[PDB]
């Protein structure tokens, strides 16, 4: 068995760490490539509306190839889209 | 540092489980839904492991097309895609 709520938290935490590492002392490319991948796949750019916004302003590269800024204001954030994926509500 | 491998292993299992469930419609429990989402989000259909379960879902229209070569011609499996998500690959 595998717990649905639990595994959403696991993935969510996992993305947080990489976002957190990808935004600071970059040069990683690693946490940066997982962040870009998470962002293109789930169509989001922050653990929250605030961080997505921020991120789009300070580090646009990490956001979906064609996302914008304003959009990040209204479009769901990665944490929502992760829950959506685990409850098959996409 | 929630373990990348370990998380990736759990998401595989979680997908397998939804998989072992969208086959028996009886209270589909969005198991079908969960499957469909993973399939559209990660762009995959089933696993090389689990060939039977795969044949079943594909036949039950849980791996929709809409293109050409992937469009249900050359699948790509969810365990690989999931691995790719957690490694910032594709």
């Amino acid at each position: 068995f595998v717990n649905k709520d639990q595994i959403a938290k696991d993935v969510k935490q996992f993305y947080d760490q990489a976002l957190q590492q990808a935004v600071v002392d970059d040069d990683a490319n690693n946490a940066k490539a997982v962040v870009k991948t998470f962002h293109e796949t789930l169509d989001c750019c922050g653990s929250s509306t605030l961080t997505a916004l921020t991120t789009s302003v300070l580090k646009n590269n990490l956001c979906p190839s064609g996302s914008n800024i304003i959009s990040n204001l209204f479009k769901e954030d990665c944490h929502q889209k992760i829950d959506d994926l685990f409850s098959g509500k996409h």
Side-chain angles (χ1 to χ4, degrees), chain A residues 56-77:
Chain A
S56 83
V57 167
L58 296 177
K59 294 205 165 300
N60 214 218
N61 170 192
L62 293 40
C63 284
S65 312
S67 108
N68 138 91
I69 302 100
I70 280 279
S71 74
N72 289 276
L73 182 44
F74 311 118
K75 131 214 279 66
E76 280 186 295
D77 74 67

Side-chain angles (χ1 to χ4, degrees), chain A residues 17-32 59 62:
Chain A
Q17 334 288 291
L19 182 59
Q20 272 270 35
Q21 281 176 58
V23 161
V24 297
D25 298 319
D26 63 304
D27 288 295
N29 261 66
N30 186 194
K32 185 193 201 193
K59 294 205 165 300
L62 293 40

Side-chain angles (χ1 to χ4, degrees), chain A residues 44-57 63 72 75 77:
Chain A
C44 68
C45 192
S47 35
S48 60
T49 308
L50 246 183
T51 60
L53 253 171
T54 298
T55 294
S56 83
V57 167
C63 284
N72 289 276
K75 131 214 279 66
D77 74 67

